[PDB]
Write a protein that binds this ligand. Structure first.
Ligand code: 5J6
Ligand code: 5J6
Ligand code: 5J6
Ligand code: 5J6
Ligand code: 5J6
Ligand code: 5J6
Lengths: 146, 145, 144, 137, 154, 154
């Protein structure tokens, strides 16, 4: 069969995204609510807008199909299967496209590495708070970023 | 949020629903066909086109539905996946693969011609379906389907 | 272990030939009979003639080896037909057809037929596309 | 039927390989290992490379088919393939003319009674051995 | 026998890495995942790239041998206590050494030798200061300044 | 996981080294003793010296950790059979991979990569030739000519 990595045309890979642990990601429900609040009109547009919009439109819809299936299930372990296992895959994909629309690919990728490194540092030995996803500087007390 | 997956491609869910189920190839035949025609483009690091970007996600979505059916009482679930969700994905995968091969304008014209032909009573219509192609058939000016 | 695809030096792959359903292919016997009728003297020649001739000569002989073994019950015959037999039908056809029509025509035809056969029968033209190099044309020369 | 001799296009014959006795040839496994150590990248290449490469690819694959089926064959089939693999891999390494010469040198050596012949076999190589004008095997 | 110190050609020593306590270091698994995320393509490269890359490549493979060994024991050892004593030795006792070495190379590739060595000292000194008398947070490994409220670093 | 081939940066591969049969290689102990006798000083040096020296230094230490483990098993495991199965696994199975790697590096430091790779193929072909049909003696690893009775090598 075909080997398509959904991240590849966007300068990333499944493996890279797997560097982030599951509890880094917002829930599917909150990712969907965020795409709407930020991008509802672009997403509903007749224009492509960008490859990230095209790709995020299909993800949203696919999740819908998986949920429409769980909801049909339906009328427990199957429903759990969807929300647990399939859940993580969609959390990573929806987070990836929505964050790239917002902060751009370079920042997103830089952030995935920062957080992935921070979370793997023993808590007693690391800064108390996680690095901040942002395009804007924090600077020294030259602009500095996360 | 109401996203029609066809709308950025100049079509709509209702338009595609003009075609009855058995017009479409099987999901398995669409997937073999995407691979025979487009595997390298689909697998590449270049966007290539919006249809490629979309076709890649559909393949993978079906994959999640089929990795679900494989992960799976068992019948109603599998039959739901393959039949109903099934029809949606037949439309969607046929639409992109046909657009990449014949271009949007031909695909949309074809949808309408086939949809019209199949609704004509069999005894009153031409014996064979219109033919999807970009190439002329012509008079006995070039004439297409 | 080596990973050798016998179609690779000829511009194709195993997965490409796999797009054709088994019932597209002539039988092994009919394929061998056809190689002989068209190519017996070039295949029996001391000249290489071409890479296709070289590979076709080995395929023909390998089949002979496989048959001597397989005749050494109809569980064994259906496995052969389903697996080894199909492999050699694809391989023998590919080589004899490329010698006859050139690689480009054959590869085009592979895709035409595998697309046609996957179109629902009630929705598709009644006859298969035709393998030849010569035009059919409108009622620009148009080929299959 | 077709009477096809797989050595014919390469300037030899089935009869000519038969002049070497079975125990001259390396095993099929050692022959496959050697094709891989020496030629794997040419063999896995999208380029024909040469007629010997083309032929060698098919032999390597044919042997696999024989084993895959048989797992789902030694005194006859095995020797035929030892001959054919050896021939192609040797020609790619030393050229046809050397391999054909060596063929005849060893087959004459091995047929000379042991107490009457040199203790060691002639050596397959392209490079001279010489007198104590270059002399080869 | 030879007495080779693996840190020596990189300007450190075994004793200096021992100035850091064990729970300073990320787990082996997290170190491996980090090497990959930051350096997979270089590590898998045909080019040497640097001496740290060469050394790192070896350390990742040596760990892999120890893992294969622990799995093998899991499979092939019939006694539970034995299988468990052996696997625990690898993961804990041997793990600590590799935690130090993988950390060392991956940090050097990221921040440079000078910074890493400075950091080793800073952390080691901070952890041994009584908690009530020291800054609440550990020193921060980076190459970038924090600065006064001249650039100041950790 | 990453897939690092320890030979790749040095112009070979695991599969190529696998062309040599196990009984071609000196014992681990004899390799270690040869490393010491030829290269102890460079190996214990503060200088990188060469990419081969860096990797050899690690392989030597990795084996060291495997030996320490074998010995630990000696003291810390009760069941005679479990102990012995672990010890033979290290010496025999893991030992083969280290014989390949240590030989490879020490040989490359001595004769250079090109000579070593040529030798690898010559021996591998020789040992696969039926003994009654091949020269009585193996090909000889050296950089120096043997010549005809232009210089000729192995
Ligand atoms: C448009 O999306 C965002 O802005 C966004 C953000 C922005 N953060 C800035 C710092 O404060 C927290 C939110 N952060 C983060 C994360 N940080 C840590 C783990 S995830 N992800 C996204 C985001 C947040 C919540 C959400 F529901 C969807 C997204 Br996408
Ligand atoms: C490339 O690796 C790193 O960047 C790295 C860091 C970077 N820190 C910056 C400040 O926040 C925590 C991480 N910190 C530290 C440590 N700090 C205290 C104890 S260890 N080590 C490395 C690191 C961290 C996690 C990891 F999995 C691998 C490494 Br290497
Ligand atoms: C030399 O080989 C051929 O000429 C050839 C042909 C030619 N066709 C022209 C149209 O009528 C049917 C034969 N067709 C085809 C096919 N068409 C559909 C499926 S296979 N294959 C080859 C061929 C045919 C029969 C045969 F025994 C061997 C070959 Br090779
Ligand atoms: C790349 O895809 C195609 O070319 C294609 C075609 C082309 N037809 C030409 C006339 O003969 C039948 C095939 N026809 C048709 C249809 N016609 C009627 C109903 S569907 N769809 C596509 C197509 C066919 C089979 C398939 F598996 C995938 C596709 Br996409
Ligand atoms: C630096 O190491 C060597 O020089 C060396 C040699 C050199 N040979 C020269 C001819 O006589 C035998 C040794 N031969 C060989 C081999 N030959 C055949 C199979 S292995 N390996 C190395 C070598 C030999 C012994 C040893 F303990 C370590 C090495 Br490395
Ligand atoms: C690449 O293949 C070879 O080089 C080769 C050789 C070379 N010989 C040189 C003298 O020492 C023995 C090997 N010898 C011989 C023979 N000699 C006597 C009987 S067979 N055949 C080939 C060869 C050897 C081993 C093998 F596994 C494959 C081949 Br092909």
């Amino acid at each position: 069969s075909m080997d398509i990595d959904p991240y590849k045309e966007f300068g990333a890979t499944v493996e890279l995204l797997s560097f982030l642990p599951s509890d880094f990601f917002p829930s599917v429900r909150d990712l969907l609510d965020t795409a709407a609040a930020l991008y509802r009109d672009a997403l509903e547009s007749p224009e492509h807008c960008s490859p990230h919009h095209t790709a995020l439109r299909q993800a949203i819809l696919c999740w819908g199909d998986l949920m429409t299936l769980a909801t049909w299930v339906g009328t427990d372990l199957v429903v759990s299967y969807v929300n647990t296992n399939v859940g993580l895959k969609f959390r990573q994909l929806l987070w990836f496209h929505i964050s790239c629309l917002t902060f751009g690919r370079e920042t997103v990728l830089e952030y995935l590495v920062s957080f992935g490194v921070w979370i793997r540092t023993p808590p007693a030995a690391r800064p108390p708070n996680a690095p901040i996803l942002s395009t804007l500087p924090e600077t020294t007390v030259e602009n500095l970023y996360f």
